[PDB]
């Protein structure tokens, strides 16, 4: 029940430590090539005390390009569609949790996400805001009994030129059996700001290593 | 002081948990291709009660090829050469130190310490359950005067799942370095050839290859 090109509503509720806080995000992305543009507002909690990209892993698998020979656990998921439970550890020991629920409702994608996060060091990027944004990135997936587990380390470009980096550790579940699950493999991602009342760009793409 | 083909020697010093070993590896690479195969013996402390694949990282980024494009600190480190401190966190706990030199002598002489502990008794590397390493992407990044590497390294167990751990390296020149590199990866693929083992890695850096 989907199309190549599609449309998707986001809502987002969140702690960042004490603060309270709720977005939403519209958009539409290609499900075949791996690209998705999402515009993503505040609707609570404004201004936000920390960088808005802790956010933007939050705001889908669907989106990813998968070729013929890797078994696409998220396309196979619909027209139920997947949840995951997520956990990312900051370098500075901080941490924060990523709940979500992709469902399909008509022709669109909806997704809830609820997104929690603690000990964010005061005077550190995050809390201070002095992230430009994320690099590129190598999620490793791989099939653990009905499950898809990703796994990859996210950098934060710093003003400075320096960065900051997580270990995310997902767990992706299709909410009906998936018949065939993959082979180990890598989704590169590439997510980027293209205006700042925030639209984002990602585009996702699987492959096995290309080294022979 | 280097060479295309450039031979090497691998002293590793050991204590997973608390069983002590020493193992020696010799062999060879290209390091402008960056590729390297090294045959690997136990010469203290047989037989090893863990997986071999847990020292596979332990037995040289000098062995890994750089595009012109993005400045090779590894490269520019020698005839002096480097080191590094890297930690590694299992999924299950477990953490190992790895300490290393990599000095020149047209042969590269290396030097490691491995030390692990809190590793599961029951777990697939005191099981010896690990059929090898999958391929990775470890995101390379400049701190300073150092270069740091992270990656999540994936080991095949035996019934098809998977036991992943988190490496993170930090690596020093002996000598100051002029150009140090932009963002980048660097992947690897690295296998056992032959089982008293003969590993083969490549390393190949690169950017990101979404546009």
Redesign the interface.
């Known amino acids: 029940g989907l199309k190549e090109v599609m449309p998707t509503k986001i809502n987002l509720e969140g702690l960042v430590g004490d603060h309270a806080f709720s977005m939403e995000g519209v958009g539409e992305g290609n499900i075949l090539e791996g690209t998705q543009e999402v515009k993503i507002s505040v609707t609570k909690g404004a201004p936000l005390p920390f960088a808005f990209d802790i956010v933007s892993v939050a705001f889908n698998r669907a989106y990813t390009g998968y070729p013929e020979e890797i078994s696409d656990y998220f396309l196979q998921s619909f027209p139920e569609g997947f949840t995951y439970e997520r956990n990312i550890r900051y370098q500075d020991g901080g941490t924060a949790i990523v709940k979500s629920d992709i469902s399909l409702e008509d022709g669109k994608f909806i997704v809830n996400v609820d997104f929690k996060a603690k000990d964010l060091r005061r005077m550190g990027p995050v809390m201070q805001q002095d992230i430009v944004g994320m690099?590129?990135?190598?999620e490793?997936m791989?099939?653990?009994v009905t499950s898809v587990?990703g796994?990859?380390?996210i950098?934060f470009?710093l003003q400075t030129?320096?960065?900051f980096?997580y270990?995310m550790r997902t767990v992706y579940k299709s909410k009906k059996p998936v018949e065939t699950m993959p082979l180990?493999h890598?989704i590169?991602?590439?997510l980027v700001k293209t205006n700042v009342y925030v639209v984002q760009h990602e585009?996702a793409?699987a492959a096995?290593?290309?080294?022979?």
């Open positions: 690099q590129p990135s190598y490793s791989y099939t653990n587990i796994e990859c380390i950098a470009k030129g320096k960065h980096t270990h180990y890598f590169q991602h590439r585009t793409i096995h290593s290309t080294i022979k």
